[PDB]
């Protein structure tokens, strides 16, 4: 029941790495895409 405990730990840390990685990927995707569209919207609004 110590091999099961160790593989529980590896899966637990692997879950946390996925949580951080996907949160950062989601933040960059959602904010990055919207701010690029807003940048295009803003530039061609106030400079054309």
């Amino acid at each position: 029941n110590i091999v099961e405990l160790e593989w529980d730990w590896v899966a637990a840390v692997l879950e946390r790495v996925f949580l951080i990685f996907f949160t950062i990927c989601f933040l960059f995707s959602a904010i990055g895409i919207n701010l690029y569209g807003w940048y295009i919207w803003y530039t061609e609004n106030h400079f054309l």
Partner: protein
């Protein structure tokens, strides 16, 4: 369109990669992924109404929904990958030396801490 889609994606991401305890078998998170994808379909359905069958370019909102669906789909696969690693314990063989070495040094960086039962087993 964008705001509820981003919120639903964020809620699903936490659902995929959060458990109630470290040392109990995780439940499958695939119906969670399939329900999130049903909702996002409902949303892209309501974005096709006020948009034509644009087959020349990919609209910015189309790239937005594509990325959210990709994140949910890979998140569903990543969640199933965690269950696979936990099943390795039931096969008897311990994790390798390097596996537990890195699992202990990336453990303080990401905010996770070793449970008491694991410490007791280590000391015993």
């Amino acid at each position: 369109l964008i705001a509820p889609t981003a919120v639903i994606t964020f809620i699903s991401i936490i659902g995929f990669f959060t458990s109630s305890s470290v040392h109990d078998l995780r439940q499958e998170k695939i119906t969670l992924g399939i329900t999130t994808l049903l909702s996002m379909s409902i949303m892209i359905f309501m974005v096709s109404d006020k948009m034509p069958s644009t087959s020349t370019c990919v609209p910015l909102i189309a790239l937005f929904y594509t990325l959210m669906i990709t994140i949910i789909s890979v998140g569903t696969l990543a969640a199933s990958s965690v269950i696979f690693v936990q099943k390795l314990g039931s096969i008897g063989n311990p994790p390798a030396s390097k596996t537990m070495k890195w699992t202990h040094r990336i453990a303080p960086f990401v905010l996770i801490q070793m449970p008491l039962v694991m410490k007791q087993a280590y000391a015993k």
